[PDB]
Amino acid sequence: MDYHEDDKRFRREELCREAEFLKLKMPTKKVYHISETRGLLKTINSVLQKITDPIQPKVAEHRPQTTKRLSYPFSREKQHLFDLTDRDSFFDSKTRSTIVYEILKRTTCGITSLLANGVYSAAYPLHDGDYEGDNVEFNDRKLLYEEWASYGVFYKYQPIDLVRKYFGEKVGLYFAWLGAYTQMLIPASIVGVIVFLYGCATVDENIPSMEMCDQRYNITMCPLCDKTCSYWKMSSACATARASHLFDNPATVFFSVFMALWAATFMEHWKRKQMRLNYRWDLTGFEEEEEAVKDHPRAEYEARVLEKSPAYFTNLVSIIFMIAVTFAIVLGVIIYRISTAAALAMNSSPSVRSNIRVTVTATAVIINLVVIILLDEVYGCIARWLTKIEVPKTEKSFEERLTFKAFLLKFVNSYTPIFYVAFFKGRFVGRPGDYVYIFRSFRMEECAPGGCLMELCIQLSIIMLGKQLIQNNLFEIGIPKMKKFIRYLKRKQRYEVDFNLEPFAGLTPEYMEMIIQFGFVTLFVASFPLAPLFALLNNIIEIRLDAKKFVTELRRPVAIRAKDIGIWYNILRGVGKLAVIINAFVISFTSDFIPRLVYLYMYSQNGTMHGFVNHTLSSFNVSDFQNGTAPNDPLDLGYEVQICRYKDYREPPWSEHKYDISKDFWAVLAARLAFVIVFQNLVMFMSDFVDWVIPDIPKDISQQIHKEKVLMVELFMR
Amino acid sequence: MDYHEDDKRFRREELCREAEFLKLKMPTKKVYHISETRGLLKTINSVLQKITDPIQPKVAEHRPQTTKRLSYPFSREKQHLFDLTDRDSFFDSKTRSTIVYEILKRTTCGITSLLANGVYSAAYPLHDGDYEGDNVEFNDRKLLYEEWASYGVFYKYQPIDLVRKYFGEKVGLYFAWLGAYTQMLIPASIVGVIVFLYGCATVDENIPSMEMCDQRYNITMCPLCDKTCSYWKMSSACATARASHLFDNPATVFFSVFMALWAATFMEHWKRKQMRLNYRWDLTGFEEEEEAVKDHPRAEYEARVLEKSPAYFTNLVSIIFMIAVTFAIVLGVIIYRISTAAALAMNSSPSVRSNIRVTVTATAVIINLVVIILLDEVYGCIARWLTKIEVPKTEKSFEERLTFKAFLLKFVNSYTPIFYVAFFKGRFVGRPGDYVYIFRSFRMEECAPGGCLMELCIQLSIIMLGKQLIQNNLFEIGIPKMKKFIRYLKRKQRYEVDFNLEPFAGLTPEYMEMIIQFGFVTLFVASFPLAPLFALLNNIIEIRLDAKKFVTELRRPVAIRAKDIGIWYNILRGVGKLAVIINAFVISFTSDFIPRLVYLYMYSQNGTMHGFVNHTLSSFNVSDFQNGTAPNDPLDLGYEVQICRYKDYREPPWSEHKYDISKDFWAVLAARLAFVIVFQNLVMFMSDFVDWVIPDIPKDISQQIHKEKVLMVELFMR
Ligand SMILES: [Ca+2]
Ligand SMILES: [Ca+2]
Ligand SMILES: [Ca+2]
Ligand SMILES: [Ca+2]
């Protein structure tokens, strides 16, 4: 039989003598506050623990612990501090666990101090029962795993007060944030789907693609290759253009405006919901003023400076971390270069002779994804090490600086390839007269046949379906199970079957995955619609996956209380700040929309647009290729290749200045920057406007706190 | 002899019978709370009033009135609510006045209700003594007028706790805001002066102006006139260019970056100082929750909807006010058009024969200033009427909506001419082949000989020295004195010499003048340096002028307490938001700096720049002027005018396309928009960064409130 405990420990069953001395000096240091026993098994021991009501209301009143009462204004029971209980056990296991952890943190000998020194190896509360077993009696964990964590309740709201009461305000806050996230992605998903469907409706009726592969024109192009390539029909590469019309139309600009508006209204709506939850749960946010615990390395550094008697070394390791950030930027770009150069001279030595020319970039970004996964792991480790060497004075400051540094590193090495593809792909390439060669060795970069917006779109597609939806979830399932198999290959009481679980690392990784998701959603939505749909599917898996990870594998967290979400809301605000200018730069420099508008309203000469590809595509006297970097096999699929047509808005070779920058390039560049100006400033004003209209504090919650405080003093006077 | 009263009234000494009935029903409604008498003079009466300590601590404890004590942590005495007094009169006159006004507002029969209905005509507390008279005994008003309001103490700090204690937290907050304003304008003034001095050092050594009036080149220009003008040497108009080099150099961009940084650091520094003042004074900001008073028209509208049983009519009058705002925009532009067309055909009928060509624009903007002064008055009146018809439910909501509407109207009609001059002056003008004519009547607009940046700079100069420094201060002195002379032409006790003063209208006009000042300072600083200097002079007059206006003419205010400055900080944040994009547009489209950089780094052909004016200035076959709109007297001051040189970056007439837009215009336009992108985004990031670095809450003030609350409960337990 097993009674009702609150917290546990782990001694190691048998210098080490002084370790045992502290190992029995700390429990007798707390034994005049609490009560504890010791458990028995031949290879694994433990230290049980029991709270006493002599002490639990005493240290409960030590803080403003605000607990429920017996009076009710309008079916909404109030919450006083402590006056009368008449049950003596109406404190839940979560409250008992956080209060005994409060006592354990109060005694120092600081439980985490010696727990990090390694004289013990565990400190965890107890889960309540088994998840859907034999003759179980409907405890909180069983009902939670039934109605919340099952994959069959993916289409229903989550019991948020239940996950609060069983897990902690922080875990309840994370899951309610995910709920509001998915509920806000639903309409953005529907609008992305209808934008893509409008593109699918107008793709067979638009002008510039049906003429980009109108046949019987026999027009050629110029090889974007290195040395060993051939001229190729522009009409032979219109699968890419006819697919890119789905990703670029006058509706994607509408969806980008709507999506920046959606990001602002989501941040406002979750500020409203977070204030609502902070009212409904514990309200007050008066925490301790850096007075609870200091770090042991902090304290011995203060002892060192006392005995020897730093303050700018935080800034020195900050510029160290910025150099590491620029290091990671350049590493991400060169890793993408290596990955897109994973098939260099693929025709000579392997002689594949299949030549789909769609698969090489797929394998390229797959290798890129694998290397950035490994780099995500090593950057998380080095961010932990850098935040440890930063020596922050508190624990929350350590967590905040670690979160900021790890997010900056993960943002850098998860967005450098997409930045390089969407913006810097075919900019710095020269003309067919001369290109740019690194080390005077080979041509540096080349964009895609049919627009490397398609490279951007397939990269985003399989980085939302090949890393987020599949790889991240499969690793999140497998790494716990692989760790449990490596512990299995290398009836029982609750405090031991709880020990056979893996410890709770933090909410930082789940927050980080979801914020990188949010960056992928709101940062590159302009060229790529239905990215809300991929995020909706990933999150409709992710909420129940995290629920299973909490109630089925993870041992019980400490249930720490928190009002804010942390720095993650400021990080959301930063990503929503960057979203408008990156959508602007995508629409201008990538979407190939401003050149279409410029042609339509400057070089029309007919009314609507026609011959836009003949307007864009320049010409080139093919006898100007330098030093034998010509096409190594001029095949003459046509009668003879006389002029190759590359699109750069340059002057034709039958002019006085040949291969010079024409007026049209400066015209489209000026109008592109004009659209960045107009779009960025207009949607920034619209974002601040929809922030200003929607009130931060809920009107209903202000009414509830008004009537609640009114009745509080009206019942306090009598 | 005169005893110590707190508040006054005014009955009218002799329907009107019911008026007298309410006139003696209201004082007997309050007489079981307070004590009052009645005064005597043959033509003017009054109603005196006296508080009693039976009642004043009673309603003082009714609110969290926080008063000083007898204990002190480290020469900083604490502030409890009410426990022990042992003096019975340590409440100041300000506290007694605001508490008797609290009682008067509590009784409704709402003192302002019947005061607005007009059964009384005054409600004001009593000033303390005479300002530097005969045998006065150094009261608060006398010491205040001596050491604060004198013009001889303009170079010393202001007694801020003294003006707090004598006037109110709101008036103390306004004057401390002005103090921090001038203290922040001092370094911006010094940097503006050194930027102007650098311009004065490099003006005789720069390239483009010394060649703009290098002689012995005999170059001509093309008349920017209507019909009756002549060609004119470009070297004859270099006073304008040699003066515009002072206002445009590579240092004005530095000063614009520094000034946006200054605006952000000023807002942050005043947030710090406002939190410091809110700690040092009354701290808590828990006001009443819309429960103190409702408006009488609000209440009778609720009676109307009760008897008949609107909510969107606030939005209907809001779009009405937006139509009025666009009305005021177009009115300001057409008023500037009328003012700059105040001398139309000035040579034919008057035959001035002086022709300085610098004075017509001066008289133009003078007429513009007079008409916008009259429009400022009528817009203030119509904003009061629109906010009254908006029917806000509270009084603070009425003041806030009135402030926002009046500021939007004053911003519109005080910045539309400067916007039209700095941006839209010479844009929509065509070429000498064809211009644009309204109604096919006459040419619409023309820019200045030598750049209408000089028009902008003289307009800003005499709108900071001819409206702010001179006209506003002289009207602020005279209108009180003119009202006192119109009351004089159409010994005594304190409650009557106080009645011979003019009532306190509000702090909204002084706030409004200073915020329009701040807009002039931070919105158009890029082209115009040393505008901080003009603001420093205006404010170094303005603080002592407002101090004299308070302690010498204005009757004593009610001394209302407030934590925030109001919506004026949000308005400062909005102006600082607009400042970066308007500085960007000034530097690009007005400063003539991006064309110089574009010439230097694209069309150099020599190294440094030379012949920039010959690069900018196009040509025009003078036989192409249409329909006899040629120069009406081609004087041939040279040998013969063959080609007139206008600057539009257009193609010369000896090309295939003549008078077509050249490549250079699109090049300089693209680079202008690139600089707007770079400057706006970079300095917006720098503004948010210098917001993030400086903490909002002062670290010292957090220490003080920490030790204060610690000792509060440590003395409360015992
Ligand atoms: Ca996932
Ligand atoms: Ca995850
Ligand atoms: Ca003034
Ligand atoms: Ca003034």
SS3 at position A146: helix
Contact list in A for residue B681 (CB cut-off 8 A) is: 581
Alpha-carbon distance of A584 to A718, in angstroms, equals 63
Alpha-carbon distance of A27 to B354, in angstroms, equals 103
CB-closest option in A663, A673, A706 to B677: A673
CB-closest option in B289, B673, B702 to A670: B673
* Cβ atoms of A350 and A274 closer than 8 Å: no
Residue B513 annotated as binding site: yes
Tell me the torsion sign for CA atoms B339, B340, B341, B345: positive
* Cβ atoms of A168 and A94 closer than 8 Å: yes
SS3 at position A665: helix
Find where tokens 């409702």 sit.
Answer: B294
CB under 8 Å to A18, separation ≥6 — which residues?
A: none
Ligand 3 centroid – CA B513 distance (Å): 7
| Residue of chain B nearest A291, judged by CA positions | B706
Q: Which two tokens stand for residue A209?
A: 């693609």
Q: How many pairs of residues across A and B have Cβ atoms under 8 Å apart?
A: 37
* Cβ atoms of A521 and A535 closer than 8 Å: yes
Q: Which two tokens stand for residue B428?
A: 């929509």
Parallel, antiparallel, or unpaired for β B442-443 and B437-438?
antiparallel
Q: Which two tokens stand for residue B35?
A: 């004590």
* Cβ atoms of B578 and B572 closer than 8 Å: no
Alpha-carbon distance of A361 to B173, in angstroms, equals 64
| Residue of chain B nearest A702, judged by CA positions | B289
Proximal ligand: closest to the CA of A477: 2
Ligand 1 centroid – CA A543 distance (Å): 9
Measured in degrees and rounded to the nearest 5, phi and psi for residue B443 equal -65, 140
Residue B268 annotated as binding site: yes
Q: Which two tokens stand for residue A306?
A: 């006392």
* Cβ atoms of A143 and A162 closer than 8 Å: yes
The DSSP secondary structure of A519-553, one letter per residue, reads HHHHHSTTT--SHHHHHHHHHHHHHHHHHHIIIII
Alpha-carbon distance of B333 to B130, in angstroms, equals 49
CB under 8 Å to B266, separation ≥6 — which residues?
A: B180, B181, B184
Q: Which two tokens stand for residue A1?
A: 């039989």
CB-closest option in A289, A662, A669 to B670: A669
* Cβ atoms of B427 and B442 closer than 8 Å: no
Measured in degrees and rounded to the nearest 5, phi and psi for residue A555 equal -70, 160
The packing angle between helices B508-523 and B396-422, to 10°, is 30
A52 to A6, A34, A128: CA distances (angstroms): 10, 7, 19
Q: Which of the residues A289, A668, A673 would you substitute to probe the B interface, choosing the one with the greatest number of B C-beta atoms within 10 Å?
A: A673
H or E element at residue A402: helix A396-422
Alpha-carbon distance of B258 to B580, in angstroms, equals 11
CB under 8 Å to A93, separation ≥6 — which residues?
A: A6, A125, A126, A128, A140
Q: Which of the residues B61, B287, B289, B685 would you substitute to probe the A interface, choosing the one with the greatest number of A C-beta atoms within 10 Å?
A: B289
Alpha-carbon distance of A567 to A651, in angstroms, equals 53
* Cβ atoms of A547 and A148 closer than 8 Å: yes
| Residue of chain B nearest A707, judged by CA positions | B289
Give all strands (DSSP E) within A14-120, no chain letters: 67-68, 79-80
**Residues in a beta bridge with B438:** B442
Measured in degrees and rounded to the nearest 5, phi and psi for residue B54 equal -50, -30
Cβ separation A676–B677 shorter than 8 A: yes
Length of chain B: 718
CB under 8 Å to B401, separation ≥6 — which residues?
A: B387, B390, B392
Residues in B whose CB is inside 8 Å of some CB of A read 289, 577, 581, 661-663, 666-667, 669-670, 673-674, 676-677, 680-681, 702, 706
Cβ separation B666–A663 shorter than 8 A: yes
Residue by residue, what is the 3-state secondary structure of B52-111? CCCCHHHHHCCCCCCEECCCCCCCCCCEECCCCCCCCCCCCHHHHHHHHHHHHHHCCCCH
**CA-based end-to-end distance of chain B:** 47
Residue by residue, what is the 3-state secondary structure of B441-504? CEECCCCCCCCCHHHHHHHHHHHHHHHHHHHHHHHHHHHHHHHHHHHHCCCCCHHHHCCCCECC
CB under 8 Å to B513, separation ≥6 — which residues?
A: B472, B542
Alpha-carbon distance of B44 to B54, in angstroms, equals 32
Contact list in B for residue A677 (CB cut-off 8 A) is: 673, 676-677
CB under 8 Å to A529, separation ≥6 — which residues?
A: A192, A195, A196, A199, A247, A251, A252, A255
Find where tokens 């400033």 sit.
Answer: A681
CA dihedral A594, A600, A602, A607 (to 10 degrees): -170
CA dihedral A233, A234, A236, A237 (to 10 degrees): 140
Q: Which two tokens stand for residue A149?
A: 């964590």
* B438: DSSP letter: E
Q: What amino acid is encoded at B296 in this protein?
A: H
Residue B307 annotated as binding site: no
Tell me the torsion sign for CA atoms B150, B151, B154, B156: negative
Q: Which two tokens stand for residue A28?
A: 């007798």
Which among B663, B714, B696, B643 has a CA at the least distance from the CA of B275?
B696
Contact list in A for residue B666 (CB cut-off 8 A) is: 663, 666-667, 669-670
Contact list in A for residue B680 (CB cut-off 8 A) is: 681
> What is the least distance, in Å, from the CA of B668 to any CA of chain A?
9
| Residue of chain B nearest A689, judged by CA positions | B574
Residue by residue, what is the 3-state secondary structure of A365-378? HHHHHHHHHHHHHH
Measured in degrees and rounded to the nearest 5, phi and psi for residue B672 equal -60, -45
**Residues in a beta bridge with A438:** A442
The packing angle between helices A663-693 and B663-693, to 10°, is 30
Residue B68, classified by CB atoms within 10 Å of its CB into exposed (0-12), middle (13-18) or buried (19+), is exposed
Contact list in B for residue A681 (CB cut-off 8 A) is: 581, 680
Cβ separation A666–B666 shorter than 8 A: yes
Cβ separation B666–A662 shorter than 8 A: no
Ligand 4 centroid – CA B139 distance (Å): 27
CB-closest option in B662, B673, B681 to A673: B673
Which among A64, A78, A105 has a CA at the least distance from the CA of A705?
A78
SS3 at position A353: coil
Cβ separation A581–B706 shorter than 8 A: no
Q: Which two tokens stand for residue A715?
A: 């019942």
Neighbouring CB atoms inside 10 A of A389's CB total: 11
Residue B542 annotated as binding site: yes
Which among A444, A459, A516, A505 has a CA at the least distance from the CA of A479?
A505
Ligand 3 centroid – CA B179 distance (Å): 14
* Cβ atoms of A331 and A375 closer than 8 Å: yes
H or E element at residue A437: strand A437-438
**Residues in a beta bridge with A443:** A437
CA B35 to chain centre: 44
Q: Which two tokens stand for residue A44?
A: 């694994």
The DSSP secondary structure of A1-39, one letter per residue, reads ------B---PPP--HHHHHHHHHHHHHHHTTT-B----
SS3 at position A554: strand
Alpha-carbon distance of B610 to A15, in angstroms, equals 82
Contact list in B for residue A289 (CB cut-off 8 A) is: 702, 706
Contact list in A for residue B589 (CB cut-off 8 A) is: none
Q: What angle do CA B461, B446, B600 make, to 5 degrees?
A: 75
Contact list in B for residue A661 (CB cut-off 8 A) is: 663
